Design a protein around this ligand. Structure first.
Ligand SMILES: Nc1ncnc2c1ncn2[C@@H]1O[C@H](COP(=O)(O)OP(=O)(O)OP(=O)(O)O)C[C@H]1O
Ligand SMILES: [Zn+2]
Ligand SMILES: [Zn+2]
Ligand SMILES: [Zn+2]
Lengths: 34, 65, 46, 49, 1105
RNA sequence: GCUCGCUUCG
């Protein structure tokens, strides 16, 4: 779940070679870096 | 691979004069007189037609078909 | 769902399902290409 | 100056790669050296016994 | 009265190319290896038996390699084409089988066809399927008819075995040492052992040094040990010159100081200086003198053979060596290593022969071990080798040695690397030039600068200009256009003719005759063949007999008047070049012979047999007189040069008028042509490689060299002819830059295609589970696949014809995590790319291991822009500085606007007059519809193209009246217009552009990665830090090297000085003195590593005030 | 992902 909005729309979307699991609703970066 | 439609420098339509040029090669015409008869006054179209290699048939020989 | 492929020498439309040994009828070639898609594709003349 | 204990470093100095494509893992040379040292200590103890 | 000249003489060159030339070397070597050498290797190890249980043996009868086949089918073979091996990522090999006879239970059992291995088949070889095929049959097999071949295909990759260069074996080398002492060295190498024995003069006396001796011993003691005990005979063998005796006096005095006067005493003294090879197994039983005699007979000077413990030949050899050292101790006539007459070239044949011999010996040893372990204790069930003949040994050995490229032969103790290299498919010229490469034994790691020089011995053999610019300058070379590498001969008739020609036996006379001024020593591959008088008659008779055909045409004979030695070379690897024989100021080749050759009456072999053209070696041509042209022929001429432009190699042949340019320009042009973009072959569409560059509309050059016609480069061009005007425009072409025309690029000029490969594998594991591809994950909201899975088809594999964007999946691969229900995790093949790509084809194949291999060929169509690198076939590499519109380009009276505007300032510093001559010839040719020739040391002259220009109404110097396109006013100076063959290079700004955000870091040291494919950041090297220090920018250096790279916050205890964690010190078991501190992560790693090394750094912290 | 080798680039 997202720590800010509590949503479950956590998508793994890499932004320019940066692995990043981020919430799809508010854009809160859950996890980043591999 | 294939004859370009437009000349690189000027832009005269040269793709339609390729096969006929080959006909002039199938006839007794040389390179210079054939290029003159085709209407290529400036040397850019002469270089375009003369220095072009017909590689499309060599590739079609390897085509699936 | 009929999945279609093309052989490397016969060039015939062969329908094979999942987990099948890659082969082609009336021959023994083992190179199987995929047919071109039917979706519309837009190209720019630039 | 004479060592009787060996300080094995943390895992940060000895990175381990989990290569799931095969049945093995990629380890640095220090881990193998420490493994061989422990094996030699055990063999020495076994021979002493 | 000028001497008549044969105009058609150059026609001798293509005929030579019909049976020999560029690629025939490796092909012939591989054929000789697989047809003759392999049988000899099998015969050398035909019988293998074990010591236990005698009367048991395994006898090989005959070995075959057969035709290439694939083991895909279940226990069935099938013919496979090399292109299929390229596609399926398998090896192109043929099953090595052998027929044998053995004894199972003392009853002879024979097998007529039992496979034992797989030999990788070289392309276009004798057993290759591609040989003896027509271009139509090549099209049926999806192989280019113009492909040079000669390379191996292993696991889908193309490996080429480079020609190795090494020093000749069994040759005395007189050289100075580190301290200036002029000593000698001889590396006696036989089929079994190679031993380098040296001789020094460190203290005015000669000591002999070998690896089998504890200390170097005087040469006189060795003389006394080898049978000759009288000192007078030793002195006579050394020489009778006064200075020779004066130099050898100290050695005799030192020998007389000791009590060594007989053979037994000398052998005992030598044995005292012999050390055991670390407790050799077996009872010695007083072997000291015996070990000394065995080392003298077998180990020392292996190439010099002793009939039955008769060291007469070895004594004469070491006496000649001492005499050479004495003569060299005066006038500094030190032999040089870079002289290519002492060089030998090993092709793929000899390397493969050694490798196969080693592998077969290992297989025989393994079989003998298995026999010894199985036969004496198993059961009454008689053991047979057939149940234990593993067939994967030789196959895996060959595959690994060819693929990895490192060769480790313990039987010969040879540890080589970089033997095989990936064939470069940048262009046809790239592969054609890489096929004829030669690496040096120096194996560049340091600045030698002694072999890197261009020696005059490379004349006609190796290309002088073609060399990789960089660290490998001078140590990687290319063969000439007309050259040949000799093979090994039988050496029998050579000895017979030498004995019949009056060569006196060396055993019949003493060494004093060696000191006579008219007596010449005759050698043979490093062995003393004997002595002779009037060596001119001997040399003339040997050359005439070689011309007649009774002696092999590759046997070389040379004479050294300084050392008075007649060398007869018959070993393989020597470089030879054909030359026309000249007798009495008139060449043997006439116009009638060339007319018969043109009509087809005779071939090059007929010229060889009729004593018209003969092969000359470097050592042989050292004594011969060669004339470049007919007018240069004088009274003292023995040979005539066939064609001077054959001096250049393959890559250098593309240079139009290379003799009008500078040598660094030619080198840079060769380097860039090795990277020139263009077509690869007629099968370039079905070919799927990891990286391919193709040209949209390639055009053959207008100024083509005869080498281009010979190598058929005009069928596969790698560039385009553009109307270049040499002038300065807008100041965007300051240093090497060029201005491109927008309208030209818009109409297809310079348009290029980049093909990349994306391969995925679905393999079956040990457990009965397999990798499976899921369908496109359709979105339930819109009933359509998601943006990531948009391009996927119904089977989860991307379909050709669509465009792929960044971070899109091509194959929806999911793999199990077990190796009870299987658990699959997704590992899709995402497309990493800045620009979009189009899928041309998707190939799906199945290997024998049920692993599905999927290869997608992505295509990108790129247009020339700012940053693309362009070449002009003259080393004038440039970058597109500005793209101006057509109306901004200047125009002539006819209305022609230039495509490429190049800076004139690049001409004076580089003196590239050849570029101007090529431009003029190309303009004349496109005017009169002809193809002028830029042949080296020849070609069309300037007067002819000037007359062609003046005839057509243009200026006789290329400069034409031009009106400025911008202001509309005529220019004050005429502009040099003309068609130039510009070639685009693979170096693009799109692939080289890089930008690095925070991104990922490395696990060991938390710093950005290295490569762009790894998305790494730039590195501030030591010199950048030095510059930042010199500027005095402390804060910028701190931000770059600490804040932005490896910043971290550690916890240090102020009591013990050690590193804590989470504000706690485990050492002191307290947390009151623990304080945070900023630090580079590499510094913390260093501190931890030092603590691991018992070097404990104790940090005493303090307030910043 | 670590290592090594080749190759290019200025
Ligand atoms: N090994 C190297 N170390 C440092 N810089 C290098 C190296 N190789 C190339 N460069 C860069 O390339 C430049 C070398 O060019 P330079 O030698 O001056 O001209 P050039 O290559 O001789 O061209 P011409 O042959 O004169 O046309 C200078 C340097 O910044
Ligand atoms: Zn034109
Ligand atoms: Zn088929
Ligand atoms: Zn503490």
């Amino acid at each position: 779940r997202c720590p800010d909005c509590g949503s479950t729309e956590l998508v793994e979307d890499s932004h320019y070679s940066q692995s990043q699991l981020v919430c799809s609703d508010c854009g809160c970066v859950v996890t980043e870096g591999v | 691979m294939i004859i370009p439609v437009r000349c690189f420098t000027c832009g005269k339509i040269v793709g339609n004069k390729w096969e006929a040029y080959l006909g002039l090669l199938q006839a007794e015409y040389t390179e210079g007189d054939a290029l003159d008869a085709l209407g290529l006054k400036r040397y850019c179209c002469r270089r375009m037609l003369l220095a072009h290699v017909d590689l499309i048939e060599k590739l079609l020989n390897y085509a699936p078909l | 769902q009929p999945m279609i492929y093309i052989c490397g020498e016969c060039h015939t439309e062969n329908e094979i399902k999942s987990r099948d040994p890659i082969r082609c009828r009336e021959c023994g070639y083992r190179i199987m290409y995929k047919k071109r898609t039917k979706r519309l594709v837009v190209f720019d003349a630039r | 100056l004479i060592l009787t204990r060996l300080l094995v470093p943390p895992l940060c100095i000895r990175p381990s790669v989990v290569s799931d494509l095969k049945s093995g893992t990629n380890e640095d040379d220090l881990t193998m050296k420490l493994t061989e040292i422990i094996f030699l200590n055990d063999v020495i103890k076994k021979h002493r016994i | 009265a000028p001497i008549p000249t044969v105009e058609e003489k150059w026609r001798l060159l293509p005929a030579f190319l019909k049976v020999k030339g560029l690629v025939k070397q490796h092909i012939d070597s591989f054929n000789y290896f697989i047809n003759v050498e392999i049988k000899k290797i099998m015969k050398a190890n035909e019988k293998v038996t074990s010591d236990a249980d005698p009367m048991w043996y395994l006898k090989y009868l005959n070995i075959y390699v057969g035709l290439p086949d694939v083991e895909e089918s279940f226990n069935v073979t099938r013919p496979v084409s090399p292109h299929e091996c390229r596609l399926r990522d398998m090896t192109y090999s043929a099953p090595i089988t052998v027929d044998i006879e053995y004894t199972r239970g003392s009853q002879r059992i024979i097998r007529n066809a039992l496979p034992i291995g797989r030999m990788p088949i070289m392309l276009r070889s004798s057993n290759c399927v591609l040989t003896g095929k027509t271009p139509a049959e090549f099209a049926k097999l999806n192989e280019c008819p113009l492909d040079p071949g000669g390379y191996f295909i292993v696991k889908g990759v193309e490996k080429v075995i480079l020609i190795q260069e090494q020093l000749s074996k069994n040759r005395i080398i007189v050289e100075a040492d580190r301290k200036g002492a002029v000593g000698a060295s001889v590396t006696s190498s036989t089929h079994e052992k190679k031993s380098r024995t040296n001789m020094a003069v460190k203290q005015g006396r000669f000591y002999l040094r070998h690896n089998t001796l504890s200390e170097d011993i005087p040469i006189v003691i060795i003389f006394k040990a080898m049978g000759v005990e009288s000192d007078q005979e030793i002195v006579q063998m050394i020489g009778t010159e006064e200075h020779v005796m004066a130099a050898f006096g100290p050695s005799l005095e030192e020998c007389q100081k000791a009590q060594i006067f007989t053979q037994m005493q000398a052998l005992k003294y030598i044995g005292n200086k012999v050390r055991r090879q670390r407790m050799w197994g077996g009872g010695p039983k007083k072997t000291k003198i015996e070990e000394a005699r065995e080392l003298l007979a077998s180990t020392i000077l292996t190439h010099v053979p002793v009939k039955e413990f008769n060291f007469r030949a070895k004594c004469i050899y070491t006496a000649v060596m001492v005499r050479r050292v004495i003569l060299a101790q005066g006038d500094n006539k030190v032999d040089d290593r870079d002289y290519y007459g002492n060089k030998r070239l090993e092709l793929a044949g000899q390397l493969l022969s050694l490798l196969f011999e080693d592998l077969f010996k290992k297989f025989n040893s393994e079989m003998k071990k298995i026999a010894d372990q199985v036969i004496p204790k198993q059961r009454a069930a008689q053991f047979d080798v057939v149940k234990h003949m593993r067939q994967d040994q030789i196959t895996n050995g060959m595959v690994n040695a060819i693929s990895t490229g490192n060769w480790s032969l313990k039987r010969f103790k040879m540890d080589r690397q970089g033997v095989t290299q990936v064939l470069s498919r940048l262009s046809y010229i790239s592969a054609l030039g890489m096929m004829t490469r030669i690496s040096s034994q120096f194996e560049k790691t340091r600045k030698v600068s002694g072999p890197r020089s261009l020696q005059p011995s490379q004349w006609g053999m190796l290309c002088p200009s073609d060399t990789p610019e960089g660290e490998a300058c001078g140590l990687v070379k290319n063969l000439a256009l007309m050259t040949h590498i000799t093979t090994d001969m039988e050496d029998g008739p050579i000895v017979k003719l030498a004995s019949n020609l009056g060569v006196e036996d060396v055993n019949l006379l003493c060494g004093e005759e060696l000191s006579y001024p008219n007596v010449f020593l005759v050698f043979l591959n490093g062995n003393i063949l004997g002595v002779i008088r009037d060596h001119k008659k001997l040399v003339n008779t040997f050359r005439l007999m070689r011309r007649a055909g009774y002696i092999n045409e590759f046997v070389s004979i040379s004479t050294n008047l300084t050392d008075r030695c007649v060398y007869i070379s018959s070993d393989g690897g020597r470089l030879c070049r054909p030359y026309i024989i000249v007798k009495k100021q008139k060449p043997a080749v006439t116009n009638k012979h060339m007319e018969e050759l043109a009509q087809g009456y005779r071939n090059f072999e007929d010229f060889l047999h009729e004593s018209l053209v003969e092969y000359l070696d470097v050592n042989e041509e050292n004594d011969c007189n060669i004339a470049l042209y007919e007018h240069t022929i004088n009274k003292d001429t023995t040979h005539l040069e066939i064609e001077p432009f054959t001096l250049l190699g393959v890559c250098a042949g593309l240079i139009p008028y290379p003799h009008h340019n500078q040598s660094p320009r030619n080198t840079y042009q060769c380097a860039m042509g090795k990277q020139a973009m263009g077509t690869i072959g007629y099968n370039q569409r079905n070919r799927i490689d990891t990286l391919m560059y193709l040209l949209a509309y390639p055009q053959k050059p207008m100024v083509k060299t005869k080498t281009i016609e010979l190598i058929e480069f005009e069928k596969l061009p790698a560039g385009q002819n553009a109307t270049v005007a040499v002038m300065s425009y807008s100041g965007y072409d300051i240093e090497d830059a060029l201005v491109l025309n927008k309208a030209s690029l818009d109409r297809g000029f310079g348009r290029c295609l980049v093909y990349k490969n994306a391969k995925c594998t679905l393999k079956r594991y040990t457990n009965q589970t397999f990798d499976k591809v899921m369908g496109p994950m359709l979105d339930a909201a819109t009933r359509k696949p998601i943006w990531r899975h948009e391009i996927l088809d119904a089977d989860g594999i991307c379909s050709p014809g669509e465009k792929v964007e960044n971070k899109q999946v091509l194959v929806n691969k999911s793999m199990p995590t077990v190796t009870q229900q299987p658990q699959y995790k997704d590992v899709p093949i995402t497309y990493k790319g800045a620009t979009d790509s189009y899928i041309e084809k998707v190939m799906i194949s199945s290997n024998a291991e049920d692993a599905f291999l999927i290869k997608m060929l992505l295509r990108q169509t790129r247009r020339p822009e700012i940053g693309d690198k362009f070449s002009s076939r003259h080393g004038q590499k440039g970058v597109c500085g500005l793209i101006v519109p057509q109306e901004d380009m200047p125009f002539c009276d006819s209305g022609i606007c230039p495509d490429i505007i190049m800076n004139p300032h690049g001409f004076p510093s580089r003196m590239t007059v050849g570029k101007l001559i090529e431009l003029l010839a190309g303009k004349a040719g496109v005017l009169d519809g002809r193809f002028h020739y830029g042949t080296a040391f020849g070609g069309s002259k300037v007067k002819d193209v000037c007359e062609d220009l003046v005839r057509h109404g243009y200026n006789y110097l290329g400069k034409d009246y031009v009106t400025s396109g911008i202001t509309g006013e005529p220019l004050e100076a005429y502009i040099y217009f003309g068609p130039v063959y510009y070639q685009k290079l693979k170096h693009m700004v799109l692939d080289k552009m890089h930008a690095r955000a925070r991104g990922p870091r490395a696990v060991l040291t938390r710093q950005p990665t290295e490569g762009r494919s790894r998305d790494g950041g730039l590195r501030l090297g030591e010199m950048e830090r030095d510059c930042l220090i010199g500027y005095g920018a402390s804060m910028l250096l701190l931000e770059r090297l600490m804040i932005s790279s490896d910043a971290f916050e550690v916890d240090v205890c102020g009591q013990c000085g050690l590193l804590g964690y989470s504000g706690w010190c485990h050492y002191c078991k307290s947390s009151c003195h623990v304080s945070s501190l900023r630090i580079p992560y590499a510094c913390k790693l260093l501190f931890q590593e030092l603590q691991s090394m018992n070097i404990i750094p104790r940090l005493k912290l303090s307030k910043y005030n």
